[PDB]
Amino acid sequence: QSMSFAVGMFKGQLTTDQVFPYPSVLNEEQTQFLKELVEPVSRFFEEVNDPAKNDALEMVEETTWQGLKELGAFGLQVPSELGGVGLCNTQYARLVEIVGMHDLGVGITLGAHQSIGFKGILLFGTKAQKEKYLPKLASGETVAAFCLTEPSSGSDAASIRTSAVPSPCGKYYTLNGSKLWISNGGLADIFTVFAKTPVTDPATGAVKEKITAFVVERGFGGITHGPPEKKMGIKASNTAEVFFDGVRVPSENVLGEVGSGFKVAMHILNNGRFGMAAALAGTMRGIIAKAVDHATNRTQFGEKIHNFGLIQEKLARMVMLQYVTESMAYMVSANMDQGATDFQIEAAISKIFGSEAAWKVTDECIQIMGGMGFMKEPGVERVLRDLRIFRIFEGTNDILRLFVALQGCMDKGKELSGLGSALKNPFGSGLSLSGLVHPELSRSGELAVRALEQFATVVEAKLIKHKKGIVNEQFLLQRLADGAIDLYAMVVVLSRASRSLSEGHPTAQHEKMLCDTWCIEAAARIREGMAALQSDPWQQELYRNFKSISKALVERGGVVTSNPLGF
Amino acid sequence: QSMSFAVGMFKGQLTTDQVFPYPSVLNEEQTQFLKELVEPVSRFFEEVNDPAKNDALEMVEETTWQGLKELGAFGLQVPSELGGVGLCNTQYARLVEIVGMHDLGVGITLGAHQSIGFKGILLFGTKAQKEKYLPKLASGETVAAFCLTEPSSGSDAASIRTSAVPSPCGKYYTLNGSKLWISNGGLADIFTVFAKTPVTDPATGAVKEKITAFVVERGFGGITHGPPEKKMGIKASNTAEVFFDGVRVPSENVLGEVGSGFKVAMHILNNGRFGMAAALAGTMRGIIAKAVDHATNRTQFGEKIHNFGLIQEKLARMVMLQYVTESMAYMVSANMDQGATDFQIEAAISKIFGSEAAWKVTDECIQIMGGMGFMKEPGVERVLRDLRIFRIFEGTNDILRLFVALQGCMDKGKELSGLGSALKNPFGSGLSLSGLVHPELSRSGELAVRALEQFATVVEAKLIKHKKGIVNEQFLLQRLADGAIDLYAMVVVLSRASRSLSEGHPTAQHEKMLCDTWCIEAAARIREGMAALQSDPWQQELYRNFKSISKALVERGGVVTSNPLGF
Ligand SMILES: Cc1cc2nc3c(=O)[nH]c(=O)nc-3n(C[C@H](O)[C@H](O)[C@H](O)COP(=O)(O)OP(=O)(O)OC[C@H]3O[C@@H](n4cnc5c(N)ncnc54)[C@H](O)[C@@H]3O)c2cc1C
């Protein structure tokens, strides 16, 4: 049985081991060590890094770049014996939130390096590969890049065309292709590269093309890159095309098993995924301070504007989004640290939620600031520009919603299918969070359980209706993913606030209020959303019309109607 | 009785004169003249203007600037006898949509000039003032700017501090102050300036400070400006502080009546307001073509992506937003052309709706484009940056929502108050759009009427509950404004699509579908929103908590909670 809450909720189960009580994973020595790192990392970003300058220069300033190498920032999760800082996922989350608060451009360059660029060596490396490569990766002497995307292939990784052909001797592969929009592509000396290779079936010998992952050194020869791409935001992060022309890659540089490269890619992206929410929780914390400062000090209509309801609601909504995001990030990191093997749905939810939350929070900060928010000097517009890409890379949020919905449906579908399987021989809910949620949160706990039942009822009905065809019911899948996102958000804040109440933390009553306020509205979204899927007779009309309207646009090449004058 | 649909709907009335049938205002000669202008204006923007270049240079290229003067673009609504092109509001809307489609930076510089910068001379000018100033304004020899905002005063125009003191002789006023974020402030030779002046009461002689509007020439002396402000978008538009130091303004340069300057400002902003929706309808038309092109031609997962439901729904929603916006823009312009005196609520709705629609449409275009959408070359990110300010200037959308809700409530409140007024002498719905909506749209017509009844029921209940105190119930006012916005959107598209059906226009069946699809979801938002206001026992809990959460943030100066680790 899966220990994943998200897997369980699609089946109408409460599987709470990875959610309650809100996890604590650090020992006393890890806690003290982390404290001694937070201080210097924070001072570095406060005193040495200049995010506006990096944005203006479209690169990280050299003194900052060298300082980050010295700080250990290129190898935070590399074991100390291999030249790194040796942090676990929860410790890493804490430092990533500092970087996210201060400079997302620096954040993406460091994350492209270690969250995904050489992460596969950490996850799948042999002892030889780890010992050869990790020390110089950790010091930043060799920068890394994750090389998957191609001109033809972004969301559909399985469709990549870069190829790696084995030598007759078996000693090397010859790699040919090009990769697109690679973070650090122009800086990296080590590339994790995904390429199609012929793979022999162990039983029959039949050869089939499958993806294999490779660790590639720039020094192998035949590797060049294009000029830095100009983009809306994260301008300090290098993004370049990378070209592989007749590159000889030693057979011992295969990462994992030949033909298992798609799995390697997906595991890397999954493993790294919590880091986005961690970073963005930090972004939001800094942005909220800016908005609150503005609202505290701006007089309009005879009062400071924090005295007006419209501003109060904006600020309240911002902090709820920050708290949910941060709670998700640390829950997933803790689950990883505690040895969870099934967290992919939760990680995807955290990425979707955190990226969209940070976008909304920063957009509302601009609105609170008024005309000032649109100006360059305050720096908020720079953060908005940086944020836009987080909804697109590391899995587009649209594809991640489909993933969440289909992955959640999978085990329920399997159960349902098992029902009518056996041959005929003719010849002879009770669900509750009582005891897990703190008593002061019992009502919100009940809202969550009722919402879970509503959700699971629709999941079952739609799987019975659509069976394996549900994969093509995208309008429905997006709406189920949204239910799933809100349900996980509810339980994560219920868990966090419950622990705060049980432990008598000083902010526990404020957290209770954040949780209750979040849960009232999330429960209503799930109720209304599930009713729209199950019992609304106009929902199918909407779906038919979305398809018809879009078809008409495509036939025309744009808007079909003229303006009212007709010309 | 008011002829405004929006005024009526707050009272539970269907006042349809300014909505059905969808207005047509141009005569045959105006139509032909407009056609002969659309062609050269479109070619100019296609062949001469370069929006990416203007953005990069942070100014309009000189050849473009001079070309626009030659094209007549600085005086579109100035009568031909006074040097202009002589267009009515509906003709102006048609040309503004071209500019909005191509270059919002150019759009704001031209709009700051004529939609608001000298608009007060058009609306309130004496014959002498019109004849003296309009010819050089229309040719672009003298650029104009609207000078209201100050460091202390943005949304609260009544609080401005710039002063104008009359001379003993009465021949001039001495103007002193500074204005902030003035579009064309560094380019203009003519300023409409709002300043506090002493005003004598005609009856008692008592002096009170009130705002007066002035036409100010740079050549009067004492006027300087600051350097161009750097900003997120519309970078080609000049934005500068303007300083008035001991400026002698002739008494004959008062615009309108002494002390009536607040009214003058509000009328200018109201009169100009439809132009925003017109421009943004054009922006959206161009952006939708870009998204549709991308979706038509991008293969992913073995198909062109327009074959996937998620993309279909995005595209359908984009065109519905464009169609609503465009329909609103031309309805308000037609109402103005036909002599409506009560259109301020509708104009505000159009500004709110169009600015938020264009933002959402462009944001979704980026999402459809994937990583490409974040890059500079495609130009979509530039349009997103340009759009952000449209939710803030010309009235912040938050203040405009409060305006819509309170202005709509006003006449209903007056009626309710009249009920318990008379002294006691002790000594002796049926509403229907039948006959207005086309029969093929009868169901959607009924949705609109039911939604109007739901809305008006809540308006009445809340006015009885809160009376004049409703002005401080901002959470409620925002939610009523949203209902009003959706209700007007429904009837505008019902009206437009009905005319298309009645006239047998070639796109009528597509328009019917746009209308029906829009109305199903808008009706549901109004139903759920009104139920939340009237019958939801947790709504007051949410409001109390928004205020409590915000208060706690303000006390702290930002987020109250630490991260889960506590440090
Ligand atoms: C600044 C930047 C940095 C990046 N960093 C890296 C990096 O370091 N390494 C790397 O390998 N890549 C990197 N990427 C690539 C990024 O991950 C991809 O852009 C992303 O995966 C989207 O792929 P795409 O742009 O090809 O869009 P597509 O996959 O073409 O998708 C286009 C649109 O269609 C939608 N869509 C696609 N398929 C479906 C479907 N079946 N059903 C419904 N909707 C669908 C998508 O959600 C999207 O909205 C980077 C990109 C950028 C811009």
Ligand SMILES: Cc1cc2nc3c(=O)[nH]c(=O)nc-3n(C[C@H](O)[C@H](O)[C@H](O)COP(=O)(O)OP(=O)(O)OC[C@H]3O[C@@H](n4cnc5c(N)ncnc54)[C@H](O)[C@@H]3O)c2cc1C
């Ligand atoms: C590029 C640019 C060009 C501009 N062009 C011009 C121009 O040509 N001429 C000119 O005069 N001005 C111009 N403006 C100014 C613009 O109109 C103002 O910025 C706008 O009116 C907002 O005022 P503010 O920035 O002072 O915000 P504030 O009024 O301080 O408002 C701040 C925030 O508080 C909210 N708020 C304020 N009061 C209340 C309340 N009572 N209840 C609830 N919420 C409230 C607002 O909605 C906003 O979210 C320009 C500004 C910019 C940035």
